Design a protein around this ligand. Structure first.
Ligand code: ADV
Ligand code: ADV
Ligand code: MN
Ligand code: MN
Ligand code: MN
Ligand code: MN
Ligand code: MN
Ligand code: MN
Lengths: 200, 200
């Protein structure tokens, strides 16, 4: 079922495209299904030798306020491998470098209307290296180190609400409590976006 | 900082509006900040007397496949209280009724480009009641009961990727392991969307 009958691009912006598709429903009808094409992104849970991780306080215009989040960046560099996008962004945002990288959790942010998918890595064996000069939203953001457990409590207390940070924080929390294990970098990323990047 | 200089509506669809704002950055510059206005939504982690919860397998056109998710619905009923939207949708989607309702976790799905926020409730004291005749995506979706721990393992294994389901599953998992506690229904929902609903 669910066959796409027609695709019409309604808008192409800086980081996503708006597309309206006509989809055939179970009953036999046809409906509007609008999708927001997104580059996709990556985030990093950089855990240090004592179980602490870095988070950034970044202003989000969508909410008109700053949220506590994990270091993260868009896959807006055509051809750049995701784990490189991760390492690059970790260094730029929290000035860190890691000797070990594994896959923590992948999340599909808003399945209802966007194809954006985000891969969260767990970076260990941390090294403090230089951080570049930031621009825009990043020139305003700050950071703080949190024990994974407190970070986990912050989520359950509503102090952390960014879906990417929630997933990574609770996922690493499950790992540090011995409930689960990290995963190989070559783990399949089923829903990694391709549409918007494919546009150009 | 970050003052909105101008707002232009680019598109109004069935469930969200696309708006392009001009925002003043730290350096003194002005940039395009496109926001997707969304009704907002609610989800339910209905836990039974033995630690099991219901999940639905629903087709998501954005990804062209079915995902395992929590029962959930849009706040598309002007005036309907969120916890009522929750109870209504729980019954309609997994044919359940609960005598107890608390707040589990709130998540801001895609902070980068949308104001959508989702409140996940934890429903207990379950009762099996009738389920209506479904339409569209819902007429195709099925469901299955999962022990919270297995559901948690499914997340860490990439078998559950919907951000709402990840948050609720790992959040309730933290509660069942005695790490955290549920919260009162009157808990403040900081980022509950208002823009799109306010349009009409
Ligand atoms: N809605 C937007 N439209 C156009 N440009 C934007 C928008 N939101 C953020 N940016 C820009 O992206 C840079 C950060 O990119 P990532 O750090 O790659 C990623 P991130 O998810 O914003 O953290 C920001 O400093 C800002 O310049
Ligand atoms: N992108 C869309 N554009 C217009 N209508 C849509 C779109 N996606 C889903 N719907 C519709 O919504 C109903 C489900 O609403 P919720 O169950 O309220 C909520 P949910 O998050 O889709 O679960 C679907 O059965 C379908 O008819
Ligand atoms: Mn970033
Ligand atoms: Mn970037
Ligand atoms: Mn960045
Ligand atoms: Mn639903
Ligand atoms: Mn509904
Ligand atoms: Mn529904």
């Amino acid at each position: 079922d669910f066959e796409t009958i027609s695709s019409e691009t309604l808008h192409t912006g800086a980081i996503f495209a708006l597309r309206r598709d006509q989809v055939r429903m179970p009953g036999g009808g046809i409906v509007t299904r609008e999708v927001v094409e997104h580059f996709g992104a990556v985030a990093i849970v950089a855990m240090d030798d004592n179980g602490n991780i870095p988070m950034v306080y970044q202003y989000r215009h969508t909410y008109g306020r700053r949220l506590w989040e994990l270091p993260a960046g868009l896959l807006d560099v055509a051809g750049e491998p995701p784990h490189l996008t991760a390492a690059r962004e970790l260094r730029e945002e929290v000035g860190l470098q890691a000797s070990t990288w594994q896959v923590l959790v992948d999340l599909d942010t808003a399945p209802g209307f966007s194809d954006e998918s985000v891969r969260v890595y767990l970076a260990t064996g941390l090294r403090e290296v230089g951080r570049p000069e930031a621009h825009h939203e990043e020139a305003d953001m700050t950071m703080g180190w949190y024990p994974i457990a407190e970070a986990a409590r912050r989520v359950l207390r509503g102090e952390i609400v960014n879906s990417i940070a929630i997933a990574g924080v609770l996922a690493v929390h499950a790992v540090t409590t011995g409930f689960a294990q990290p995963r190989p970098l070559d783990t399949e990323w089923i829903d990694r976006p391709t549409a918007f990047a494919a546009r150009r």
